Amino acid sequence: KAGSFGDLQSRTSTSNDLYANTNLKLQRPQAGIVHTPFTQVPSGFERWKKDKGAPLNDVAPFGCSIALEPLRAENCAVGSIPISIDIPDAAFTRISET
Amino acid sequence: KAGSFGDLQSRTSTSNDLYANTNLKLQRPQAGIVHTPFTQVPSGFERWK
Amino acid sequence: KYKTKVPSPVVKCCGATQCTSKPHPDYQCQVFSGVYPFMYGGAYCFCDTENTQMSEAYVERSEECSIDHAKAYKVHTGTVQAMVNITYGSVSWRSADV
Amino acid sequence: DLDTHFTQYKLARPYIADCPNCGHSRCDSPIAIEEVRGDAHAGVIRIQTSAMFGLKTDGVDLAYMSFMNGKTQKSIKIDNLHVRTSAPCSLVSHHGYYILAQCPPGDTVTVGFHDGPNRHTCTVAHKVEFRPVGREKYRHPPEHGVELPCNRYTHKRADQGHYVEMHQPGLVADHSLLSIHSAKVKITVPSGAQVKYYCKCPDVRKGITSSDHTTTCTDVKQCRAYLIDNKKWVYNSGRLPRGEGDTFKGKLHVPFVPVKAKCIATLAPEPLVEHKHRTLILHLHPDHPTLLTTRSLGSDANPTRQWIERPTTVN
Amino acid sequence: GDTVTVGFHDGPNRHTCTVAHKVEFRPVGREKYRHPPEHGVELPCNRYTHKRA
Amino acid sequence: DLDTHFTQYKLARPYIADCPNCGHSRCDSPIAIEEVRGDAHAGVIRIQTSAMFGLKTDGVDLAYMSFMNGKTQKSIKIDNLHVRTSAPCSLVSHHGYYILAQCPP
């Protein structure tokens, strides 16, 4: 989008193709001095860096944080759980001993 | 009032008692360098000024 | 964030050349006329109408792209798991995930 | 290390180009500024000039600086060298073509060094910014506070995480060596250069290693000279003309690299809380524009965030 | 800036004087500056020449 | 007066402590800044450094400066001394542990 959020989109971390534009333009050098003038739109990645909205970890309902590495959404409290547990029979005792 | 208009109230011009608070707080020094960090509310007298 | 690089342009003391398009991300090239350039204490590489200028432009990733870089993702349901601390009868606190 | 400094100095050499130092109206200097870089949160910047720093001609004494004087090389001890944005900065390290320094905010970056007759200063109009980490704006990070992960340019002499190409130098125009012979032009040779000379008649336009002359014109003003040298190499740049040099895509590792590290942040002064029942009252006394964020825990979030600048109260 | 000062040395003295006087950097055309860049468009401006007489 | 300068120099001595001059990453200097003060309407400020100014070891020549070199005392003539806020300032007076100067914002 000529520098809004995608202007350099590497398909991978170390790909060799960048299927996006930057609206680059050249200029005519003047006064007979060896230089290469040009002009282009400023990087849109910076602009999105400046105007990021509310991060998700400050808007998630039900009060649950957000870890990073597995994209854990921890502790998000909601609803109930059907539980079913079995204990060994060696932990009971005869009713006449109490 | 922790620095709104009264935070240092000397009863007289040269009294020896200042019956007001400044919400002073200390901090833990780091990196093994001899200094005494702290923090406190800015003086409320300035704000009223 | 991107970065634009430019190879050294080429000029001729007389005549003219033409630039060719190469397979590069947002490649650019163009030619200009009547340079009559200048150099330090030099003969300034001209005797007549120059009409030689390459001024090619080139776009690629920055060297600091390795550290800070947004990533896009697609998301689906995935799994659910937790951890539990347990105690029954007289057995002490026992903990495991599930 | 010294080996990496050698690979830097193996074939590189300083060079002269133009800078728009308007104190002297577009002067051509050995210290030509090219693509200053600053994106580190701590406010450091590194600049890639056009002169070789560090080692002398031998390849030691990293307190030396070598530049191009006229058409020759010249090394000299670093006597007085400064980098100035709006107030004098403080430089950290320097190696070959690069200098890493620390500057306050400003608008125009300038660099200058003395030799005794000259101040050798160049200037580039280029925005420079001081980006604060975390949530509290700065003027400079204080002595004490909280730690945060930041990123900044390291200060090690050598590395290989990036490198730039060193390329064959092009021809260099000249006329000083074009003298008068006795009644016509005269070409001398610097003993190892191809003096590409051309005049009203087609001359040897490739350069000869033997002193010669032509009589197509007597005045030097009709003939041009173009020294050709291929003993060293330079970093090709859009501010430098390129001859037929299309060879030796050599590599030169960058001296400094951005890496992640830890920085020190400021801890805002305490709030004054008021648990007034059925609601909440806060008194805030900031010292810098400081963030604030709240959220509910029920079904709805109702987020709330805004900066705070003047001591205030909120409900 | 805001205050113009001028100083020159003789060896015992710095010989400095100061005048509080507004100074401004007026940009030509339509785009504000911090200093005019190396390349761009030309425009007719006005400024003090630099000839001796 | 000289007597007051003597009472200042009678038992005082410079000392070395740390300052966060980040041009060199938390350096320990004889010139350690402590509690700069400015509240005057005219824009003057006085700073209380960590080195003795004015008199030499003898107690005269208020154009001298004595500091701590390594673990010893050392006095030297004031050669080049400057105070800088955003532009070079102009200092007015100095005595022992204190310097009074005039700075812009």
Swiss-Prot record, chain C:
Residues 35-52 are annotated as: E1 fusion peptide loop. It is found in: Virion membrane; Host cell membrane. Disulfide bonds join C13-C45, C14-C47, C19-C29. Glycans are attached at N85. N-glycosylated. It is a single-pass type I membrane protein. It comes from the Viruses. The precursor of protein E3/E2 and E1 form a heterodimer shortly after synthesis. Processing of the precursor of protein E3/E2 into E2 and E3 results in a heterodimer of the spike glycoproteins E2 and E1. Spike at virion surface are constituted of three E2-E1 heterodimers. After target cell attachment and endocytosis, E1 change conformation to form homotrimers. E2-E1 heterodimers interact with host VLDLR or LRP8/APOER2 to mediate viral entry. Interacts with 6K protein. Class II viral fusion protein. Fusion activity is inactive as long as E1 is bound to E2 in mature virion. After virus attachment to target cell via host VLDLR or LRP8/APOER2 and endocytosis, acidification of the endosome induces dissociation of E1/E2 heterodimer and concomitant trimerization of the E1 subunits. This E1 trimer is fusion active, and promotes release of viral nucleocapsid in cytoplasm after endosome and viral membrane fusion. Efficient fusion requires the presence of cholesterol and sphingolipid in the target membrane. This is Spike glycoprotein E1. It comes from Eastern equine encephalitis virus. The chain holds residues 848 to 945 of 1239 of the full protein.
